[PDB]
Amino acid sequence: VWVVGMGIVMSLIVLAIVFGNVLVITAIAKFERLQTVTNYFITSLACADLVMGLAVVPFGAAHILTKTWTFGNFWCEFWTSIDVLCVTASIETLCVIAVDRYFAITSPFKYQSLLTKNKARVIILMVWIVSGLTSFLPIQMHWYRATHQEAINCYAEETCCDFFTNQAYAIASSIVSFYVPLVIMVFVYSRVFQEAKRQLQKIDKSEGRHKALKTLGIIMGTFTLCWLPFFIVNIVHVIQDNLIRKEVYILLNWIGYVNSGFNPLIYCRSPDFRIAFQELL
Numbered sequence: 425v426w427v428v429g430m431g432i433v434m435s436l437i438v439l440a441i442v443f444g445n446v447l448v449i450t451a452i453a454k455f456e457r458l459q460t461v462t463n464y465f466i467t468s469l470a471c472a473d474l475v476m477g478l479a480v481v482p483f484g485a486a487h488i489l490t491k492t493w494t495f496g497n498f499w500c501e502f503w504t505s506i507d508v509l510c511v512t513a514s515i516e517t518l519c520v521i522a523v524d525r526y527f528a529i530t531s532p533f534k535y536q537s538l539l540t541k542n543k544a545r546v547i548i549l550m551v552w553i554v555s556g557l558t559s560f561l562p563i564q565m566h567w568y569r570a571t572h573q574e575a576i577n578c579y580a581e582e583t584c585c586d587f588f589t590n591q592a593y594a595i596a597s598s599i600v601s602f603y604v605p606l607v608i609m610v611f612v613y614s615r616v617f618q619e620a621k622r623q624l625q626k627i628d629k630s631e632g633r634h635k636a637l638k639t640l641g642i643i644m645g646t647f648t649l650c651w652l653p654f655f656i657v658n659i660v661h662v663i664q665d666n667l668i669r670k671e672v673y674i675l676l677n678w679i680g681y682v683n684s685g686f687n688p689l690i691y692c693r694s695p696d697f698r699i700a701f702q703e704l705l
């Protein structure tokens with residue numbers, strides 16, 4: 425008396441993610457004046473989120489509900505590679521957007537010279553290629569597999585595939601994918617908030633006779649609350665295997681996926697985006 429329910433939730437999540445990604449992508453594509461250096465970074469993130477919602481979630485849902493994987497093992501390896509690719513690409517695109525905002529605010533006169541139409545494509549391609557090399561190379565080449573009897577049983581067993589990794593690979597992947605972007609974003613947003621506070625203190629001297637805090641808080645808190653616990657459990661569970669089981673791991677992992685759906689809503693809030701959406705519907 426619970427199988428008929430959770431499928432509804434999974435379908436709702438899939439539909440929400442797909443619709444949110446497609447609307448933003450088509451709004452940027454089909455309108456004349458929405459092209460901007462900043463919007464391309466949003467386009468890359470939307471493309472990554474669309475791939476995640478289209479490929480990763482539906483098969484994982486079938487695996488969880490059925491409890492049996494009715495395909496091959498090479499397909500499981502490919503699915504894992506695609507999952508890692510999409511996650512790391514999304515995180516790195518977020519950090520790139522943050523750095524672009526820092527460059528725009530800190531140095532207004534020289535903002536044009538640093539970033540142009542030509543130099544955004546190279547950055548996007550580098551982000552995507554470093555995301556791809558992090559996932560496909562260690563996975564598709566059989567170079568992450570564990571050496572325990574329980575893990576080798578899973579690898580040899582064709583029906584069921586579960587994620588087991590050596591501690592070194594887990595630490596390196598987590599460090600490359602999560603910690604450095606978090607540090608960068610923290611530093612960027614601290615500096616930006618300081619600059620905003622300085623300007624708000626400067627205006628009151630002449631204009632005699634909060635909002636930025638709320639905006640920065642929401643922007644940072646969404647990402648932190650969505651993705652932080654998973655990358656803590658990932659590091660901790662490998663050093664000592666007694667503490668954590670598979671169910672908690674899966675629950676913490678599935679929380680991160682929902683973040684991809686929320687992100688177009690938080691980033692696409694400009695009045696121009698609102699007018700573009702209004703023109704469609």
Ligand SMILES: CN[C@@H]1CCc2c(ccc(O)c2O)[C@H]1O
Nearest residue numbers: 507508511512587597598601677
């Ligand atoms: C199947 N779930 C995977 C398992 C481990 C992992 C994920 C995402 C990014 C990484 O860098 C990882 O090492 C998760 O999405």
